[PDB]
């Protein structure tokens, strides 16, 4: 299922941006021997493991079959490790809610939670942990369908997200699904503050402390107590007490049936949102 690419079988066209370790390019996968050109997004990882191992990990990242968990399509092992995945046209859901603050309504926000949760639940059911789930790691296929990206990358690359990590992770470097729910909670806080930065104004080396003291992210304005409390119930000190993703998917799908009742957005009733040539095949289309 994992396709091994030659540095020739693809070409980085643009630089969509660089995050943690490496940079992301908008490229095109040209399967040697076929006129077809598949739009993809290439990620080149900045160089303590070996190449024979990396492979065994990819084999597993390119095994996650689910509508909300972005799957690995191929890998390119040379002087650098390059990951090939289907190209997501609308960008990270973080940059989305920022440039659309006033235009995103109840129904949508709530759905995304429900989707992201479905993704996290997928991985959970397989005893797989993400570790770096954040608003910046959920791409938008379409404004109505989002999906989690960069799973297993963190495990593959050893600056760590302190604000998104659960306490025990920060203190004892212990990552479990139970921590991922903590990550989720923050991610959800991000969407609710339409992209606002968490604990902004506090220094990472200090988070650990203000957290122990029982201080958590603030209740967004648009969030009716009932919603804020699920997020908050994800940041409990006692991990095994945090909501499992299944519990979330529900508590959250149950609010999407009447969005306006759990989210108070001004002017919700009136809101709306949205290269070619020929031989452009969708990743979907090429990998039957």
């Amino acid at each position: 299922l994992l396709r091994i690419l030659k540095e020739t079988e693809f070409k980085k066209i643009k630089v969509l941006g660089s995050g943690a370790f490496g940079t992301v390019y908008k490229g095109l996968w040209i399967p040697e021997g076929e006129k077809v050109k598949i739009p993809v997004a290439i990620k080149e990882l900045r160089e303590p493991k070996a190449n024979k191992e990396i492979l065994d990990e990819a084999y597993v990242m390119a095994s996650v079959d689910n509508p909300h968990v972005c799957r690995l399509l191929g890998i390119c092992l040379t002087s650098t490790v390059q990951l090939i995945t289907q190209l997501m046209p609308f960008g990270c859901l973080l940059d989305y809610v920022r440039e659309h603050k006033d235009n995103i309504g109840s129904q949508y926000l709530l759905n995304w939670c429900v989707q992201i949760a479905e993704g996290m639940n997928y991985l959970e059911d397989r005893r797989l942990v993400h570790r770096d789930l954040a608003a910046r790691n959920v791409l938008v296929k379409t404004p109505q369908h989002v999906k989690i990206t960069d799973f297993g990358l963190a495990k593959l690359l050893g600056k760590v997200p302190i604000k998104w990590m659960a306490l025990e992770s920060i203190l004892h470097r212990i990552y479990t699904h139970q921590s991922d729910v903590w990550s989720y909670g923050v991610t959800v806080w991000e969407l609710m503050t339409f992209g606002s930065k968490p604990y902004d104004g506090i220094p990472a080396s200090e988070i650990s402390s203000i957290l122990e003291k029982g201080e958590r992210l603030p209740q967004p304005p648009i969030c009716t107590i009932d919603v804020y409390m699920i997020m908050v119930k994800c940041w409990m000190i006692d991990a095994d007490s945090r909501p499992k993703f299944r519990e979330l998917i529900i508590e959250f799908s149950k609010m999407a049936r009447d969005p306006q009742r759990y989210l108070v957005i001004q002017g919700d009733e009136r809101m709306h949102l949205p290269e070619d040539m020929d031989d452009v095949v969708d990743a979907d289309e090429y990998l039957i």
């Binding site: 604990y199 003291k213 029982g214 201080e215 958590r216 603030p218 304005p221 409990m236 000190i237």
Partner: peptide
Amino acid sequence: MPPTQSFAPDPKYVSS
């Protein structure tokens, strides 16, 4: 909105 909201002395959110 303020950066942090307290939850103490709630034993559930304050470690000891």
